[PDB]
Design an enzyme around this catalytic site. Structure first.
Site, mmCIF file in Angstrom:
data_model
loop_
_atom_site.group_PDB
_atom_site.id
_atom_site.type_symbol
_atom_site.label_atom_id
_atom_site.label_comp_id
_atom_site.label_asym_id
_atom_site.label_seq_id
_atom_site.Cartn_x
_atom_site.Cartn_y
_atom_site.Cartn_z
ATOM 1 N N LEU A 118 0.830 -1.195 0.000
ATOM 2 C CA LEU A 118 0.000 0.000 0.000
ATOM 3 C C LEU A 118 0.869 1.252 0.000
ATOM 4 O O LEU A 118 1.981 1.250 0.535
ATOM 5 C CB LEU A 118 -0.936 0.008 1.210
ATOM 6 C CG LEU A 118 -1.987 -1.103 1.218
ATOM 7 C CD1 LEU A 118 -2.710 -1.154 2.547
ATOM 8 C CD2 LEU A 118 -2.972 -0.917 0.078
ATOM 9 N N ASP A 119 0.358 2.310 -0.620
ATOM 10 C CA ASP A 119 1.043 3.593 -0.668
ATOM 11 C C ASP A 119 0.743 4.368 0.620
ATOM 12 O O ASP A 119 -0.177 4.038 1.371
ATOM 13 C CB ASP A 119 0.601 4.344 -1.936
ATOM 14 C CG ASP A 119 1.010 5.815 -1.967
ATOM 15 O OD1 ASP A 119 1.772 6.282 -1.098
ATOM 16 O OD2 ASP A 119 0.557 6.519 -2.893
#
Ligand SMILES: CCCCCCCCCCCCCCCCCC(=O)OC[C@H](COP(=O)([O-])OCC(O)COP(=O)([O-])OC[C@@H](COC(=O)CCCCCCCCCCCCCCCCC)OC(=O)CCCCCCCCCCCCCCCCC)OC(=O)CCCCCCCCCCCCCCCCC
Ligand SMILES: CCCCCCCCCCCCCCCCC[C@@H](O)O[C@H](CO[C@H](O)CCCCCCCCCCCCCCC)COP(=O)(O)OCC[N+](C)(C)C
Ligand SMILES: CCCCCCCCCCCCCCCCC[C@@H](O)O[C@H](CO[C@H](O)CCCCCCCCCCCCCCC)COP(=O)(O)OCC[N+](C)(C)C
Ligand SMILES: CCCCCCCC/C=C\CCCCCCCC(=O)OC[C@H](COP(=O)(O)OCCN)OC(=O)CCCCCCC/C=C\CCCCCCCC
Ligand SMILES: CCCCCCCC/C=C\CCCCCCCC(=O)O[C@H](COC(=O)CCCCCCC/C=C/CCCCCCCC)COP(=O)(O)OCCN
Ligand SMILES: CCCCCCCCCCCC(=O)SCCNC(=O)CCNC(=O)[C@H](O)C(C)(C)COP(=O)(O)O
Lengths: 70, 88, 55, 84, 128, 178, 124, 103, 459
Positions: free
Chosen positions: B42-43
């Site tokens: 995930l960013d």
């Protein structure tokens, strides 16, 4: 002093029939009172005495002579 | 008030619930100790979105300085427990 | 029923030469009409507070 | 005495975007090339007893039916009594 | 482009609209680091004295005493008669007195005159 | 709150804080959840189109126009969580927070009630007394010369040690003492 | 409102000033000039101590209304008739006031017409 | 980003200490050791001690001390209407001037 | 009047012949009994006065001041018991001796049928106060404070003496009764103007007047608690009492000569109330509040109307009680925190609730909440000023608003908010402090039931 109602977590909350019947009863009582007063006393909103038209009054009862008498 | 005295189990279950309702994560691979950046890819924008979801679901705000270093569900649960002073 | 009105100057407090100050109550239409309304509202407020401020 | 009933959460697979305004939100988002990832987190707001809504005027007319029935019964009874 | 926010005395500039934060330099970074160093040293001293179980009193604060001393007792030895100081003192300490004297004197002279002509209507004026 | 602050905020931290603030204020503007979700996806997209910019001068010219636009359209009455620094119940229960040392001033008749609590309190006080002597030495040896540079504290290193300066973090009154 | 528009946007001398009305003699219109009739006297209208602004030509109906209310204290709703008689008399009073307003307006119209006709005749 | 290992360890240790303190804040079943020592009915007694006695005292004070002095209690001189008769004198107020009653 | 003077004198040998650990008990008990005896002076007449002898006479202006003076000594002893614990028996006996001598001089000053005797005792009160300030004060500024408190006073009082003897060389007497009965107008002359100034300035400096108030903050801040109590409660009222006595020979010259002092007081009340809003010290704030209240009393005395005099008497009594209570509260905080900085110890309501109630009631009386005697005097003076000139209402209302503002600011800063974390030596309030606070405050709320006792001779 009330009844035991547990949390629900993302559903509709539990409702007792007592509160529903009381809310419905008081809403119906309010609307019935409004209707009863409107039926018996309509002039409290609409008025009882018609508003006269000043342009419909004849020159006689207001004491107007045709510009030459007085 | 009449608010139940929430426990660690409830916080863990609710955090995992919110995370499984995030569709960029597959729920079956999700775990309490899974890292957000590497175990799930995930960013940091996704991480701040997850923090916002946790805030909106528990009804209180996590400050930016504390929020920006919460990378696992377990440590999110621990932060919430420390803030709310949960016993067990 | 009647329209009954009173001034009740019950306790005489200090008198200042030609000025007399006394504990006097005016019990006109405004007072006798507003007191029951305020008492009713305060009664409802206190019953509500017994639940709102329980903690 | 407190609320100690060991509440258990509902199943997470229960929530769907289908049949909610989140569906048309997803549709309009797909028209420009994006997706809503938190849609199912909000489906519970359109699912259970929250699924049906009422209008403003309908909210105003909460008890018009039974109150109106009471009104008509009362006016009919009064008309019958005074015509005597 | 959007309308520009104009800061004032009582509505200051936001931190996120400050051009200085967007103009970074190594000197700025070292200044921030050493400001944090001063703050950390002060915090460490305070917490070391604060968590001590043997301490049973007020933690003395030199900054607070410096503030109070500067506010009260450091004023006069640092005072100089200056055109700004002299004019401000004369104005703010004399002008209101003479202004109020003029106002009250005019009002009372008018009242006294009106009493002299008798056109004041002092009826029911018993208590004075 | 808990974490020690740094000397500065990096560019990524500034961008993430702007992202969170803009999303919260858009939620304040977009009251309904579906409308908010749509506009928040658009907002995320508008952030994402410059995710990969390599020019730092370009990226710093950005975020500046962005914060100016935010200040223009910032919903002057945003939603605040009730316990947050702007909320309607922010410091509501501070008047109920009593320090722990006040119990030392209780009358013996007051301490006659709750004897187990005060026995455990005595145990805690003894633990604090010993741990403090260990903590002072550990902090003195671990701190760099010239004073600390960041207000971050070390954990315990040995078996019987306790974290330095722990008493006033462990013995907080409560979030809602009464 | 319509009268305000004709007095603020039109001619001020065309319509009355409500402060100074009337500006013409009463018996100017017709020589009958009947008097207004008052039923309540000084003493009874004082003893009922209604109000200074209720002490008008409608006072007797108010007296009757007050008496009816007083006797039937428990049944407040019972004295419906007294209220109607009083508001009808007030309606007649207001109609008379409107008639005075319209009368003075027409007299002002006729006076302006007479003066302009005289001016035309004199200039001719 | 994220916690450094020292931050994790310190947070964990502080967390364990805090939870033990919080657990120790609880009360034993005997903890409030109370030292005992001494030396319609509810509505009926309430309406006597809180309504009847104050009204008795106030009525006595008004009727026998306040009313003793002049002008202390002044009433309204109740309204007199035509057709009324007066208790003290017995005379009857004359009626009004028989106005025309129509509509 | 000797039935009050002789027991006060006997307080001294009783103090010096007491056991080392019985001085406070004996002094307190017998001072309370002297107060109870003096309470019977309140039975005043509608006619002239209580003329006991050729030397002493009582008046319904003098009687409330005498009773307050007698009541203040036990409270001063109770307040002084704490901080004198570590000091030798001889020095504590000397301190109690100074307090007793101050009471004796004040008692003889307030009766003092002679103007020269009044001046002698009115200046004899100076010595015990100076010794108390410069001997048992804490900071290094006390000496400086003492110097101010000395010279200001004498700078005003030396001309008065000359004026006084001058009057007796012309009138033939300085007896107050003969002066009142044989009074004559003062012609508008330069010599009469300077006689007026010599008569007024001595009492003006000790009110104090706004321009001449520099000595008061120093003297009240650096004095011990008993010194501050006696300075604020009784010693400030000597100027008002002297003006009320001496303005009988200054008519009609007071009409012209009152203007500069009226302007000074009306503007200085605003100035000092505003100063209170920005104050970092509790004692200095209370001192400036005293300056504002005494400015109002100066206005009342200068207007010289019946309502003015009644309001001034009531306000003098009420201010004495309220300021003594406020100083005692500040000292209770100080003996715990040892700082006297208002911002340091915060949120004391959560730790000392009953002391918070005392703070609230003291602030309420300082705020002049009706029907307190503070507001009775305030309103009487304000109405008299309004009759004097309708424009005084702006200044009076502004003063009321600022007074409420700074009183509630003082209450909120010290009692509300969050407690200071590093301060852990705030012990529970002692029975002595609570008893002191009640003995201050119950007389006020009990005097509001019988106002004519403190409304002066023009009631
Ligand atoms: C209103 C009618 C009252 C009738 C009942 C009789 C009451 C007698 C009281 C006499 C004076 C009180 C003594 C002062 C010290 C307080 C002692 C204390 O510490 O309490 C411990 C005790 C135990 O509590 P605790 O739990 O142990 O302590 C916890 C903390 O202390 C925390 O405690 P707390 O949070 O509860 O606070 C303590 C409380 C108590 O502390 C106070 O603040 C009391 C002082 C307030 C006055 C401030 C000065 C302003 C000037 C007013 C002068 C009025 C005096 C009249 C003559 C009095 C004779 C001595 O403070 C308040 O609650 C704030 C009340 C604000 C009232 C402001 C309104 C004033 C004007 C009202 C009308 C007066 C004239 C009426 C004319 C027309 C009608 C005839 O608490 C009480 O008993 C409360 C006291 C009663 C409340 C007083 C409020 C109104 C009374 C006004 C005076 C008498 C009115 C006469 C008219 C009768 C008709
Ligand atoms: C804790 C919660 C409350 C519990 C208690 C409930 C009971 C409350 C009742 C008490 C307060 C309510 C006010 C009601 C007052 C009733 C008594 C009052 O009416 O009597 C007053 C009488 O009291 C006095 O007037 C006031 C007392 C005087 C105070 C002297 C101070 C004491 C000396 C201390 C040293 C002085 C220090 C200050 C120096 C100036 C006024 O009476 P008055 O109509 O007028 O004439 C008296 C009777 N006559 C007619 C025969 C002449
Ligand atoms: C500093 C803190 C406060 C301290 C106390 C301040 C209060 C002191 C104020 C003194 C009160 C007034 C003093 C004199 C009042 C007389 C009236 C005068 O002001 O008006 C004119 C007076 O004219 C001129 O003033 C003449 C004198 C001019 C010289 C005075 C110096 C001016 C400023 C000095 C002020 C310094 C004060 C402090 C000194 C150390 C009217 O002239 P005229 O009608 O014909 O004569 C009236 C007097 N007669 C009738 C007796 C003859
Ligand atoms: C209580 C239980 C005991 C019951 C037995 C007593 C029953 C009542 C009999 C009382 C005897 C009558 C009496 O009280 O005497 C009158 C006496 C007044 O004294 P007088 O000298 O007559 O006149 C006043 C000026 N001198 O009345 C009283 O004192 C009792 C009632 C007084 C009124 C109530 C006062 C309450 C408010 C307190 C004062 C508040 C401050 C002042 C406000 C100013 C407002 C303008
Ligand atoms: C806080 C510090 C204030 C210092 C003192 C302030 C008060 C000053 C008042 C004047 C002081 C002395 C006045 C004299 C005392 C009264 C005696 C008197 O009235 O007799 C006068 C005498 O009048 C004088 O002699 C006055 C001379 C004053 C000389 C000293 C001047 C002091 C400073 C003057 C300017 C300031 C004045 C007011 C200051 C107020 C305080 C700030 C008339 O008597 P005869 O002359 O015998 O009869 C007339 C026919 N021959
Ligand atoms: C409704 C209220 C007003 C709203 C108006 C506000 C307008 C804002 C829109 C402006 C557009 C921008 O993004 S401003 C452009 C700022 N500069 C950059 O984005 C350069 C590199 N990007 C990053 O470094 C980010 O952190 C990222 C890699 C995404 C995450 O990092 P993580 O991997 O560490 O999470």
């Amino acid at each position: 002093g009330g009844v035991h109602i547990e949390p629900r977590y993302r559903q509709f909350p539990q409702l007792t029939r007592s509160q529903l019947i009381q809310a419905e009863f008081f809403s119906a009582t309010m609307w019935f009172w409004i209707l009863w007063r409107f039926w018996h006393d309509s002039d409290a909103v609409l008025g009882h005495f018609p508003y006269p038209d000043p342009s419909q009054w004849t020159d006689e009862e207001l004491g107007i002579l045709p510009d030459d008498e007085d | 008030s009449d608010a139940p005295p929430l426990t660690l189990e409830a916080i863990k279950d609710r955090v995992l619930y919110v995370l499984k309702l995030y569709d960029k994560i597959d729920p079956e691979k999700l775990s309490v100790n899974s890292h957000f950046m590497k175990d799930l890819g995930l960013d940091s924008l996704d991480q701040v979105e997850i923090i916002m979801a946790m805030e909106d679901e528990f009804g209180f705000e996590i400050p930016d300085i504390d929020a920006e270093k919460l990378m696992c569900p377990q440590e999110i649960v621990d932060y919430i427990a420390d803030k709310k002073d949960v016993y067990e | 029923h009647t329209g009954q009105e009173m001034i009740i100057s019950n306790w005489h407090w200090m008198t200042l030469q030609t000025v007399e100050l006394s504990l006097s109550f005016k019990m006109d239409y405004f007072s006798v009409m507003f007191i029951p309304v305020a008492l009713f509202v305060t009664w409802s407020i206190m019953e509500f507070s017994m639940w709102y401020m329980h903690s | 005495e407190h609320g100690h009933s060991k509440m258990e959460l509902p199943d997470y697979k229960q929530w769907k975007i289908e049949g909610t305004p989140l569906e048309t939100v997803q549709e309009k988002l797909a028209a420009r090339g994006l997706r809503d990832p938190w849609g199912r987190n909000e489906a519970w707001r359109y699912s259970g007893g929250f699924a049906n809504n009422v209008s403003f005027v309908g909210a105003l007319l909460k008890g018009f039916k039974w109150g109106f029935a009471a009104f008509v019964v009362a006016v009919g009874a009064e008309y019958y009594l005074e015509s005597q | 482009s959007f309308p520009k926010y104009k800061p004032s005395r009582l509505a200051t500039l936001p931190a996120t609209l400050d051009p200085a934060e967007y103009d970074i330099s190594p000197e700025t970074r070292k200044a921030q680091a050493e400001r944090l160093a001063i703050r950390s040293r002060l915090k460490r001293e305070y917490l070391l004295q604060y968590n001590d179980p043997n301490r049973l009193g007020v933690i003395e604060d030199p900054a607070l005493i410096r503030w109070t001393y500067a506010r009260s007792a450091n004023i006069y030895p640092n005072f100089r008669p200056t055109p700004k100081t002299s004019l401000l003192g004369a104005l703010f300490g004399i002008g209101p007195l003479f202004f109020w004297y003029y106002v009250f004197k005019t009002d009372r002279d008018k009242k006294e005159k009106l009493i002299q002509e008798g056109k004041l209507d002092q009826t029911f004026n018993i208590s004075y | 709150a808990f974490s020690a602050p740094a000397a500065y905020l990096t560019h990524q931290q500034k961008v993430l804080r702007l992202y969170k603030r803009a999303l919260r204020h858009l939620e304040s503007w977009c009251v309904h959840r579906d409308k908010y979700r749509y506009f928040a996806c658009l907002m995320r997209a508008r952030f994402d189109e410059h995710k990969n910019e390599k020019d730092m001068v370009k990226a710093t010219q950005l975020l500046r126009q962005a914060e100016e636009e935010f200040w223009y359209g910032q919903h002057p009455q945003p939603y605040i969580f009730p316990e947050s620094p702007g909320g309607t119940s922010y410091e509501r229960y501070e008047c109920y927070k009593v320090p722990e040392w006040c119990l030392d001033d209780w009358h013996p008749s007051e301490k006659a009630m709750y004897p187990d609590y005060f026995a455990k309190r005595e145990q805690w006080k003894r633990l604090r007394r010993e741990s403090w002597e260990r903590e002072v030495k550990q902090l003195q040896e671990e701190t760099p010369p010239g004073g600390p540079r960041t207000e971050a504290l070390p954990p315990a290193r040995k078996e019987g040690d306790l974290p330095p300066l722990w008493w006033h973090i462990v013995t907080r009154p409560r979030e809602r003492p009464m | 409102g319509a009268h305000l528009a004709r007095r603020y946007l039109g001619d001020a001398s065309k319509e009355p000033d409500p402060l100074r009305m009337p500006t013409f003699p009463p018996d100017y219109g017709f020589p009958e000039r009947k008097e207004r009739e008052m039923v309540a006297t000084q003493q009874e209208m004082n003893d009922a101590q209604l109000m200074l602004q209720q002490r008008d030509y409608c006072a007797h109906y108010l007296i009757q209304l007050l008496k009816c209310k007083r006797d039937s204290f428990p049944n407040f709703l019972a004295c419906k008739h007294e209220q109607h008689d009083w508001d009808y008399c007030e309606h007649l009073d207001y109609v008379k006031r409107m008639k005075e307003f319209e009368r003075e307006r027409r007299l002002l119209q006729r006076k302006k017409r007479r003066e302009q006709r005289e001016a035309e005749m004199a200039r001719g | 980003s994220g916690y450094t290992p020292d931050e994790k360890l310190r947070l964990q240790q502080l967390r364990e200490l805090r939870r033990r303190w919080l657990k120790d804040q609880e009360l034993s079943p005997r903890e409030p050791v109370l030292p005992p020592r001494r030396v319609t009915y509810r509505h009926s007694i309430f309406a006597v001690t809180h309504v009847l006695i104050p009204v008795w005292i106030i009525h006595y004070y008004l009727k026998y001390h306040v009313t003793a002095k002049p002008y202390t209690v002044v009433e309204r001189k109740p309204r007199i209407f035509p057709g009324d008769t007066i208790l003290e004198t017995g005379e009857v107020i004359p009626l009004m001037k028989e106005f025309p009653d129509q509509h | 009047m000797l039935k009050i003077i002789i027991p006060t004198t006997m307080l001294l040998p009783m103090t010096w012949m007491s056991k080392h650990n019985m001085i406070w008990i004996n002094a307190t008990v017998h001072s309370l009994l002297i107060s109870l005896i003096s309470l019977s002076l309140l039975n005043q007449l509608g006619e002239n006065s209580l003329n006991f002898s050729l030397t002493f006479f009582s008046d319904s202006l003098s009687a409330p001041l005498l009773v307050l003076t007698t009541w203040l000594l036990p409270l001063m002893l109770m307040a002084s018991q704490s901080h004198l614990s570590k000091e030798t028996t001889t020095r504590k006996k000397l301190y109690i001796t100074m307090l007793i001598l101050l009471q004796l001089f004040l008692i003889m000053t307030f009766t003092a049928t002679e103007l020269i005797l009044f001046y002698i005792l009115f200046e004899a009160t100076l010595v015990p106060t100076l010794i108390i300030i410069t001997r048992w004060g804490n900071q290094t500024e006390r000496l400086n404070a003492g110097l101010y408190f000395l010279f200001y006073t004498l700078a005003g009082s030396l001309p008065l003496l000359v004026a006084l003897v001058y009057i007796q060389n012309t009138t033939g007497s300085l007896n107050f009764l003969i002066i009142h009965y044989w009074s004559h107008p003062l012609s508008n002359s330069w010599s009469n103007i300077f006689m007026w100034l010599a008569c007024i300035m001595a009492f003006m400096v000790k009110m104090p007047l706004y321009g001449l108030h520099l000595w008061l903050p120093k003297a009240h801040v650096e004095a011990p608690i008993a010194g501050s109590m006696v300075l604020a409660a009784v010693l400030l009222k000597l100027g008002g009492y002297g003006m009320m006595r001496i303005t009988t020979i200054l008519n009609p010259l007071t009409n012209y000569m009152a203007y500069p002092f009226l302007m000074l007081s009306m503007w200085g009340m605003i100035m000092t109330s505003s100063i209170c809003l920005r104050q970092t010290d509790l004692k200095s704030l209370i001192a400036y509040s005293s300056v504002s209240h005494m400015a109002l009393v100066i206005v009342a005395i200068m207007i010289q109307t019946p309502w003015s005099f009644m309001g001034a008497t009531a306000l003098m009594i009420a201010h004495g009680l309220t300021s003594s209570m406020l100083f005692c509260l500040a000292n209770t905080n100080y003996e715990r925190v040892h700082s006297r900085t208002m911002i340091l110890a915060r949120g004391l309501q959560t730790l000392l609730p009953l002391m918070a109630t005392w703070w609230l009631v003291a602030s309420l009386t300082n705020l002049a909440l009706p029907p307190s005697i503070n507001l009775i005097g305030e309103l009487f003076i304000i109405t008299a000023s309004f009759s004097w000139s309708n424009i005084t209402i702006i200044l009076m209302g502004m003063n009321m608003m600022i007074t409420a503002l700074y009183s509630l600011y003082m209450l909120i800063t010290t009692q509300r908010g969050k407690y200071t974390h590093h301060i852990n030596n705030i012990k529970p309030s002692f029975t002595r402090e609570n008893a002191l606070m009640a003995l201050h405050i119950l007389p006020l709320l009990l005097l509001t039931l019988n106002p004519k006792m403190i409304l002066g001779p023009l009631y």
